[PDB]
From a paper:
The natural compound betaine and the recently developed synthetic compound monepantel are both anthelmintics that target the acetylcholine receptor [name] and its homologs in nematodes.
In the cryo-EM density map of the monepantel-bound state, blobs of density that are absent in the apo and betaine-bound state are clearly visible in the inter-subunit interfaces in the TMD, situated at the extracellular half of the membrane. These extra densities match perfectly with monepantel molecules. Formation of the monepantel binding pocket involves M2 and M3 from one subunit (referred to as M2(+) and M3(+) hereafter), M1 from the neighboring subunit (referred to as M1(-) hereafter), the M2-M3 loop, as well as the Cys-loop. Monepantel binding in [name] is achieved almost exclusively by hydrophobic interactions, involving Ile 292, Val 295 from M2(+), Ile 309, Ala 310, Tyr 313, Thr 314 from M3(+), Tyr 244, Leu 247, Pro 252 from M1(-), Met 299, Pro 300, Thr 302, Val 306, Pro 307 from the loop between M2(+) and M3(+), and Leu 161 from the cys-loop. The only exception is Asn 248 from M1(-), which forms hydrogen bond with monepantel. Wedged into the interface between the neighboring subunits, monepantel is sandwiched between M3(+) and M1(-). Bound monepantel pulls M2(+) outward away from the 5-fold symmetry axis, the extracellular half in particular, and results in a slight rotation in the clockwise direction when viewed from the extracellular side, as manifested by the movement of side chains of Leu 286 and Ile 290 (and EV5). Consequently, side chains of Leu 286 and Ile 290 deviate away from the center of the pore, and eventually cause widening of constrictions at these positions and opening of the ion conduction pore. In the betaine&monepantel-bound state, these constrictions become much wider, with the smallest radius of ~3.1 Å, which is wide enough for dehydrated Na+ or K+ to pass through, as supported by MD simulations.
Residue numbers in the entry:
A (entry chain E): 187 to 372
B (entry chain D): 249 to 372
C (entry chain D): 486 to 533
The structure:
Amino acid sequence: YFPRTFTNGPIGLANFLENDAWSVLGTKVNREEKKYTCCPVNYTLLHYDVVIQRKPLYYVLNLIAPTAVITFISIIGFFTSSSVHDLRQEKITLGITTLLSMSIMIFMVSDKMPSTSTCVPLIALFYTLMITIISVGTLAASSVIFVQKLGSIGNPPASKTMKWTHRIAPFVLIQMPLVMKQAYAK
Amino acid sequence: LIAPTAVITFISIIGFFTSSSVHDLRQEKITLGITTLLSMSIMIFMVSDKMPSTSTCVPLIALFYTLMITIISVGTLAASSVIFVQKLGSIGNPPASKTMKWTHRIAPFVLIQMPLVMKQAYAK
Amino acid sequence: NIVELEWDWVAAVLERVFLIFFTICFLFSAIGINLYGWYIWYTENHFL
Ligand SMILES: C[C@](C#N)(COc1cc(C#N)ccc1C(F)(F)F)NC(=O)c1ccc(SC(F)(F)F)cc1
Ligand SMILES: C[C@](C#N)(COc1cc(C#N)ccc1C(F)(F)F)NC(=O)c1ccc(SC(F)(F)F)cc1
Ligand SMILES: *[C@@H]1O[C@H](CO)[C@@H](O[C@@H]2O[C@H](CO)[C@@H](O)[C@H](O)[C@H]2NC(C)=O)[C@H](O)[C@H]1NC(C)=O
């Protein structure tokens, strides 16, 4: 067996119809002689290689954009409150609903892939970070409620946190409420 | 594919910018936005299974869904900025300086009128 | 408490402005996209 190549390369592309999802980067052909245990004589094999590159815009829009928007919005909900001197509501329900939707998206996307264990795709790392931010963000929001609850349990006030808290206060654009200023003067 | 999404988007808009009182703290609308956003994602996945999955063009329906998503997501942030503005009353007592003349002129055009308690405070 | 009332008033007017702004944006987006699409569809069969 011998190969017959074209002007553009081993595989002709003069009549090729472009694919909407893949690009043909190039083609290769190799002629190799091989021995097999079933026969005392060699065999002649022709190897044709096609290199194809995916067009990513479709998958970025459909698999990454929707998840990023939801994750960004939920972050604001975790660390936002309507008042400074009022008890906060638990954000566990907000985290659970966001977490459960991402699980459905993972199952939907997982149906489009080989289901191999050899590698961890790039998109898998993106989803893992989104899950970690939401799950860890839920615990961080609950720790804010924990710190506020220390005021009721006894009256040991903050000892050294108050100087650190005041210096950080201007850099993160938050200012003291009027009642706290009145209490300090009193 | 279009009618069900428009009805949900329109209803959610009213919920973002409606309140039962003027002088009470507002509830966050993040949960309302998240639930609406997550449903549209399922709708997008369902519709996406009926299409070639090409990358050459952006269909007419894709632009419609993008606008619906943007309105809900940007509308959720606009509703949170209303809570931010109201919270300025508690943080110190710097009152509005020049906003109050502009706020009074716009007030009649958008059909909203002052509550009685606010009018009583002004007279006091 | 008057300072709180004044900032309550500003927020009440502002969210009323948001309601009007986002209602027109929705109407022009839903109606505009579909009306444009129908226009393209109508000219194809009827003239081309
Ligand atoms: C969508 C999917 C992808 N990619 C599919 O899976 C794979 C597919 C292929 C192929 N070929 C190779 C490896 C994997 C896996 F499974 F190694 F990722 N899976 C995820 O994206 C994912 C992410 C985090 C979590 S664990 C959490 F708790 F959610 F963080 C679970 C699933
Ligand atoms: C339903 C679907 C359509 N049309 C299918 O996709 C496509 C299909 C074809 C074909 N043939 C060509 C292009 C696209 C894409 F993907 F370019 F649009 N996709 C959407 O409608 C969409 C909208 C916004 C977002 S991103 C958000 F954050 F939601 F705004 C993601 C998906
Ligand atoms: C049959 O196939 C074998 C595959 O190994 C060929 O072995 C090559 O022999 C040449 C010398 O004739 C060496 O220069 C190459 O290095 C060998 N191959 C490799 C991979 O090293 C063999 O030549 C072929 N033809 C026969 C055996 O008649």
